[PDB]
Copies of this chain bind each other. A is one copy, B any other.
Amino acid sequence: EGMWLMQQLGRKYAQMKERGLKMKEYDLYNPNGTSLKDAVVLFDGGCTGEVVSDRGLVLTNHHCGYDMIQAHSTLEHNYLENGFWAMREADELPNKDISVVFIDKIEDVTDYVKKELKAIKDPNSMDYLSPKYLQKLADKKAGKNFSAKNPGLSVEIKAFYGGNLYLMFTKKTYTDVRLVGAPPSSIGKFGADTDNWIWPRHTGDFSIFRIYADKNGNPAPYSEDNVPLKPKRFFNISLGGVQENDYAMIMGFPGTTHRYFTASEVDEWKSIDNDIRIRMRDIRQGVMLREMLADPQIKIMYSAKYAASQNAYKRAIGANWAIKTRGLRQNKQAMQDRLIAWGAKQGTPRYEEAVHEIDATVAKRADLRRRYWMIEEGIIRGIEFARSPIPTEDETKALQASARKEAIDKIRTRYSKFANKDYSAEVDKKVAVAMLTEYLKEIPYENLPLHLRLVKDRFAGDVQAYVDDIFARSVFGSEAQFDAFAAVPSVEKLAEDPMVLFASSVFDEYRKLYNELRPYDDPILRAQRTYIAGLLEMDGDQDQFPDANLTLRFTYGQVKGYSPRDNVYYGHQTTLDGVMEKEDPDNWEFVVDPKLKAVYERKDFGRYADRSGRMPVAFCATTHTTGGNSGSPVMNANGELIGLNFDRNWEGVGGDIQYLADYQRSIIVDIRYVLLVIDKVGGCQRLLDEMNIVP
């Protein structure tokens, strides 16, 4: 059910031990010693990773290492499609702008922060949540020259439970993290977009890196003189596998949750955020799909844009399914009613007053928030020519010195970025006509961005004519129209350009809405501090976890499948046989690697197959995870590595507001499948040899 603070391990230990945990408490998390927590890293600022050897070998997801694999790929050595397997440490590829963060120490600094906050004076100050203010307190507690006296170490204070608890983290950051291994994309991203958020899952979502450091194991930027880090702790790999009901636990960095949403915030999330994103993306994707299906060249140009739009579209459908079917609104309503009844009995009205302030703030901002989501989904991300070039103040104050050519060169660079090899003006006009037709039906004339008033005023409500006129008369409507402008440029031409005016007025409205909506965040945040304080005072902090905030957490549960719908059961484990069932040679998403297909046919599974001779691929668990948990180590009752978390099923996206015991599952790549791929596909025996594999 929860995403627990490391401090909460003491209070959860007896429940974990009854559920199957076998390791000693301090072997998992020791606040003043070495523990398993010391083998967990925040990988590249978003993902989780884990150290799996005494030479700093790190495992994370393939989608986590995707950018590094792509940056080292060329036409001659396409690592993204073929996989990468460094046969010696010297062949491991350095990565620019990478980092791994270890959580060296964690301390409760609540009383210290609350004492410092007493000097504020202004009761409505937001300093209690300010990263700048909390950094000043972190620095004061750690000392003037902390990072100079403790190289590689840094401090950070974060707020938890809406400002009712504060923790100081002592972090050790390494920036020389080299690419060691990766399966082909056919394995690393087998399901590709079709199987995103899907269980059963057959994706070998892993990649391998290595942390390098100076001669003393201290952090150091990339240098050819750097040596592999010898860490104080690494995970042992288990080859014992998993069974239904086995205890499983994860450590990682879940990003965000909204477990303390009021019922009014759940209604707002459904009726505004989700319904608008669903409606607008369905229109956009429908036009894009029609055009991609009709022209093979349009499919090539728009495939990535279509897939990117689909990600949050699918998430919103999953979230709305939970709101409709799992009683999310009703459960938040019962939580707040129970606090209100308890507050009335204790004679303290501040809790009911805080819930009232959140409801009133939500109700007040409804029209503005609807307008913001409509323009953001409908135009800002919906229409490509909304991001067409807008001449800067220095560019207009250059066209009207011979630096007219410099301004034109900068405008041309932005025009070529907008109208690139993947941009179709015809596809964009079709998308804009459908998107604007919906936007104009939903937003009244008086709330429209200034240029969109021309649809009714100048074009007699003809959206197609308004869009045609933008491209026909704009200097960014075609290459020939831009070149005619670039030969005889004038500020008068740019100031009256229909595309520039559209882009300017839609971005003006988008910013004006953002500015009007920003003040509504603070009364909700302040009321949440009081709301969560009451929930904690009423029921305690030993069943009510703090919202995720990109900090180290543990979660535990069992390896267990679930029933998605009447008469259908999805088991706890997928197999290599399931990859072969999904093979479609003429569908790029479901192509199967020839070496992997050969391994399956010859049953060359070695020590990685289960007791029945079947090769495991992935498993699912009742652990509570979210975005940020990608690459998290999944542990046995003994703390041994049994897999890597890589996804969550769509039925569990609602889990960020309310954990769903009968539907929500973490989707995990089995460590036996990771080793089978390293061994039989990569042939990288040295990686297997440096790991500590337990029978």
Residues of A within 8 A of B (CB): 200, 202, 290, 293-294, 561, 565-575, 577-578, 581
Minimum C-beta distance from A589 to chain B (A): 16
In the complex, are the beta carbons of A569 and B566 less than 8 A apart? no
User: What would be 19 A-B contacts, judged by CB atoms less than 8 Å apart?
Assistant: A200-B567, A200-B568, A290-B290, A290-B293, A290-B294, A561-B567, A565-B578, A565-B581, A566-B574, A566-B577, A567-B570, A567-B573, A567-B574, A567-B575, A568-B570, A568-B571, A569-B569, A569-B570, A569-B571
Minimum C-beta distance from A286 to chain B (A): 8
Q: Chain A binding site: helix, strand, loop or mixed by DSSP?
A: mixed
In the complex, are the beta carbons of A575 and B581 less than 8 A apart? no
**Which residue from B290, B566, B578 sits with its C-beta under 8 Å from A567?**
B578
A294 proximity list for chain B (CB < 8 A): 290
| A581 to B567 alpha-carbon distance, docked (Å) | 12
Q: Which residue of B lies closest to A576 (CB)?
A: B566
A567 proximity list for chain B (CB < 8 A): 200, 561, 570-575, 578
| A566 to B600 alpha-carbon distance, docked (Å) | 15
Minimum C-beta distance from A244 to chain B (A): 12
- Give me the 4 closest cross-chain CB pairs, A-B, nearest first: A566-B578, A200-B567, A569-B569, A567-B571
A574 proximity list for chain B (CB < 8 A): 566-567
* Tally of this chain's copies: 2
Of A290, A294, A569, which is in contact with the most chain B CB atoms at under 10 Å from its CB?
A569
| A567 to B290 alpha-carbon distance, docked (Å) | 34
A578 proximity list for chain B (CB < 8 A): 565-567
A571 proximity list for chain B (CB < 8 A): 567-569
Of A294, A568, A575, A577, which is in contact with the most chain B CB atoms at under 10 Å from its CB?
A568
A575 proximity list for chain B (CB < 8 A): 566-567
In the complex, are the beta carbons of A568 and B566 less than 8 A apart? no
Q: Which residue of B lies closest to A618 (CB)?
A: B567
Of A566, A567, A571, A581, which is in contact with the most chain B CB atoms at under 10 Å from its CB?
A567
A569 proximity list for chain B (CB < 8 A): 568-571
Q: Which residue of B lies closest to A294 (CB)?
A: B290
Q: Which residue of B lies closest to A202 (CB)?
A: B566
| A584 to B428 alpha-carbon distance, docked (Å) | 32
| A567 to B574 alpha-carbon distance, docked (Å) | 6
| A569 to B574 alpha-carbon distance, docked (Å) | 12
Q: Which residue of B lies closest to A619 (CB)?
A: B567
Minimum C-beta distance from A545 to chain B (A): 30
Q: Which residue of B lies closest to A579 (CB)?
A: B566
Minimum C-beta distance from A423 to chain B (A): 24
| A200 to B571 alpha-carbon distance, docked (Å) | 17
Given A561-B567, A569-B569, 11 additional A-B pairs, CB 8 A? A200-B566, A200-B568, A290-B294, A565-B581, A566-B581, A567-B571, A567-B575, A567-B578, A568-B568, A568-B569, A568-B570
Minimum C-beta distance from A182 to chain B (A): 25
| A202 to B566 alpha-carbon distance, docked (Å) | 10
| A573 to B569 alpha-carbon distance, docked (Å) | 12
A573 proximity list for chain B (CB < 8 A): 567
Minimum C-beta distance from A498 to chain B (A): 28
Minimum C-beta distance from A279 to chain B (A): 14
| A573 to B563 alpha-carbon distance, docked (Å) | 14
Minimum C-beta distance from A17 to chain B (A): 30
A200 proximity list for chain B (CB < 8 A): 565-568
Minimum C-beta distance from A273 to chain B (A): 22
| A575 to B566 alpha-carbon distance, docked (Å) | 7
| A566 to B573 alpha-carbon distance, docked (Å) | 9
| A565 to B569 alpha-carbon distance, docked (Å) | 11
Q: Which residue of B lies closest to A199 (CB)?
A: B567
| A290 to B581 alpha-carbon distance, docked (Å) | 30
| A200 to B566 alpha-carbon distance, docked (Å) | 8
A577 proximity list for chain B (CB < 8 A): 566
| A602 to B567 alpha-carbon distance, docked (Å) | 22
A565 proximity list for chain B (CB < 8 A): 200, 578, 581
Minimum C-beta distance from A59 to chain B (A): 24
